[PDB]
Symmetry: C2
Subunit: 85 residues, 2 copies
């Protein structure tokens, strides 16, 4: 059972879903959906921060317990002050 | 090595993205997006090729795939996306 779904409420009246994958061998991933595309991300720092696997994307997901923030480019905010719902 | 994205061309000028998760130890999952939600799915250990069902029992999406082809249905095999093939 290596896959799970989280839903967050974020600033400016928005919702962010994240699918988390945690393999039995210890590899962690996250998938978000932005602009009608699903973007797979890999764990890069450990709260827990994930970065897009496809280098053509610059999305980064920073999580800390039940909170999160999604940025792009030079840590420019996309979704801020996210909290687990 | 474990996560990949497939894009399918389907009937009626529709496109379907699927994220496939295939772990090193051989476990298989899929993720699709419908009605603006991501739906995680698990492989059904059944007749080839690779058929998936939503992990959340509130959803009735099933994804049936065979080689390069796929079909997405819901409920009693009600078509959602039909005659899908890997884009080429
Ligand atoms: Na981007
Ligand atoms: Na047709
Ligand atoms: Na693999």
């Amino acid at each position: 059972q290596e896959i799970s779904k989280s839903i967050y409420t974020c600033n400016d009246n928005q919702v962010m879903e994240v699918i988390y994958v945690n393999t039995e061998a210890g590899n962690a991933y996250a998938i978000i959906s932005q602009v009608n595309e699903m973007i797979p991300m890999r764990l890069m720092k450990m709260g827990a921060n994930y970065e897009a696997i496809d280098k053509n994307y610059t999305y980064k997901l920073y999580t800390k317990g039940k909170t999160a923030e999604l940025v792009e480019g030079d840590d420019k905010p996309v979704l801020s002050n996210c909290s687990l719902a």
